DNA sequence: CGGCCTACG
DNA sequence: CGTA
DNA sequence: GCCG
């Protein structure tokens, strides 16, 4: 078992679902307290279990697995012996956890805002609605649409949506393409939102594209909310339903074709996978990775990549298809 | 112990 | 601060 | 919280 999640295949479904879910609760709670370090360890431990070829049945099977120390091992031990971990259950029922989860789920609210609201004594969505003067325009949209945004987006909804985005994109710039990224590209059948990556095969033609796309989507009556030169837009879209519609979060991002492999890799995730890949790159290879490129700070040069395969090769890693990046 | 991904709106 |  |  290698130490970085980007060094091992992690499938979407696996053999340790209950154990991973418990560790991820502890990870999430650590994030609500501002401990990114402990959030990372619990996420990494969870991800290790996702990568195993069969169920963990005995405590001895954790010996020598990376990211399992005294704490994560005790969590697994208790689950194996009793079916339940007292620490996890205490977190699940804490007012702090439940409220921070509720608030951070709102589009436009992060941990810092949620925590301040918690310290002010606020606990429910109706508490936030009663004092609407304190909300940003983003948070008001987030609150208004919260019920719809809490319903999973189905993979079966995505194709019709991609088609409407493609029509707007084709008008904005003939020849521009739309690629489905995020969890759906990793094989998920649901998601909290839809992620699209837009480019054009002629380098430079994509400049100024996103505003043109957004204007056209807005003219079609499809945009319930968006922030408005730019290259990422975090929107709420109107998605057709039988006799009606629902609000759906959609991310649109533009990249030049030179950067497309880096953008595709970054936006395809998973979030832990990409953090681990970037850490691997810097710490093991001395190269700086982001969604735009891969930089050698000794030579002061960018790696040219024509594919995700190129990027894995330049980092000395075995290629993983998107379906095995579910860290 | 230091480090924990790296960007854009 | 929010967002990915 | 864990790794190196
Ligand atoms: N490097 C980096 N990438 C991120 C972060 N947050 C984040 O979502 N991403 C990337 C990895 C994700 O898989 C991708 C899309 O984000 P997402 O929140 O829509 O996640 P998803 O599609 O996997 O999940 P979901 O919609 O099924 O819930 O963007 C971050 O903080 N850093
Ligand atoms: Ca998504
Ligand atoms: Ca997204
Ligand atoms: Na939020």
Asked if strand B contacts A179 at the CB level, meaning under 7 A, the answer is no
Task: Among the bound ligands, name the one nearest to the CA of residue A182.
Answer: 1
b/e string for A223-237 if b means 16 or more Cβ within 10 A? bbbbeeeebebbbbb
> Do A236 and A218 form a contact (C-beta atoms < 8 A)?
no
**Is the beta carbon of A282 within 6 A of some atom in ligand 1?**
no
Cα separation, A286 vs A280, whole angstroms: 9
> Do A179 and A219 form a contact (C-beta atoms < 8 A)?
no
Cα separation, A203 vs A287, whole angstroms: 24
**Is the beta carbon of A31 within 6 A of some atom in ligand 1?**
no
Cα separation, A195 vs A179, whole angstroms: 8
Cα separation, A46 vs A17, whole angstroms: 9
Max CA pair span of chain A:
61
Cα separation, A49 vs A115, whole angstroms: 31
Question: Would you say how long chain A is, in residues?
Answer: 327
Q: What is the resolution of this structure in A?
A: 1.9
Q: At A122, list the tokens.
A: 């606020």
> Do A65 and A30 form a contact (C-beta atoms < 8 A)?
no
| Cα-based torsion angle of the residue sequence A181, A305, A319, A322 in order, rounded to the nearest 10 degrees | 0
- C-alpha radius of gyration, chain A, whole number: 21
Cis status of the peptide bond prior to A67, with omega within 30 of 0: no
Ordered strands of the A193-199 beta sheet: A177-180, A193-199, A244-254, A232-241, A223-225
Q: At A41, list the tokens.
A: 């360890």
> Do A260 and A199 form a contact (C-beta atoms < 8 A)?
yes
Closest CA to A138 of A64, A225, A209: A225
Q: How close are the terminal C-alpha atoms of chain A, in Å? A: 13
Closest CA to A161 of A226, A219, A245: A245
Q: Domains of chain A (ranges plus CATH)?
A: 1-94 (1.10.150.110), 95-151 (1.10.150.20), 152-257 (3.30.460.10), 258-326 (3.30.210.10)
Closest C1' nucleotide to A30's CA: D1
Asked if strand D contacts A71 at the CB level, meaning under 7 A, the answer is yes
Closest CA to A193 of A300, A64, A105: A105
Cα separation, A84 vs A89, whole angstroms: 8
Asked if strand C contacts A170 at the CB level, meaning under 7 A, the answer is no
**Residue whose pair of structure tokens reads 């990376």 in the numeric block:** A66
> Do A52 and A67 form a contact (C-beta atoms < 8 A)?
no
Cα separation, A244 vs A98, whole angstroms: 31
């Amino acid at each position: 078992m290698p130490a970085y999640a980007c060094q091992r295949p992690t499938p979407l479904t696996h053999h340790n679902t209950g154990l991973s879910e418990a560790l991820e609760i502890l990870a999430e709670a650590a994030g609500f307290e501002g401990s990114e370090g402990r959030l990372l360890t619990f996420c990494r431990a969870a991800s290790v279990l996702k990568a195993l070829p069969s169920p963990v049945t005995t405590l001895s099977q954790l010996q020598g697995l990376p990211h399992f120390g005294e704490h994560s091992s005790r969590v697994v031990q208790e689950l194996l012996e009793h079916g339940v971990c007292e620490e996890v259950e205490r977190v699940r029922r804490s007012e702090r956890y439940q409220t921070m989860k509720l608030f951070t789920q709102i589009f436009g609210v992060g941990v810092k805002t949620a925590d301040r609201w918690y310290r002010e004594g606020l606990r429910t969505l109706d508490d936030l609605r009663e004092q609407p003067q304190k909300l940003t325009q983003q948070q008001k949209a987030g609150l208004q649409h919260h019920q719809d945004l809490s319903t999973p987006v189905l993979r079966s909804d995505v194709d019709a949506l991609q088609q409407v985005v493609e029509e707007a994109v084709g008008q904005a710039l003939p020849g521009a393409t739309v690629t489905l990224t995020g969890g759906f590209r990793r094989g998920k059948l649901q998601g909290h939102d839809v992620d699209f990556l837009i480019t054009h095969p002629k380098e430079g033609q994509e400049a100024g594209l996103l505003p043109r796309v957004m204007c056209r989507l807005q003219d079609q009556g499809l945009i319930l909310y968006h922030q408005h030169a730019f290259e990422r837009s975090f929107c709420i879209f109107r998605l057709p339903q039988p006799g009606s519609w629902k609000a759906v979060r959609v991310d649109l991002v533009v990249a030049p074709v030179s950067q497309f492999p880096f953008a595709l890799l970054g936006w395809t995730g998973s979030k832990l996978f990409q953090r681990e890949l970037r850490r691997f790159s810097r710490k093991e290879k001395g190269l700086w990775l982001n969604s735009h490129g891969l930089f050698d700070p000794e030579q002061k040069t960018f790696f040219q990549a024509a594919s995700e395969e190129d990027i894995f090769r330049h980092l000395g890693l075995e290629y993983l298809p998107p379906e095995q990046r579910n860290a």
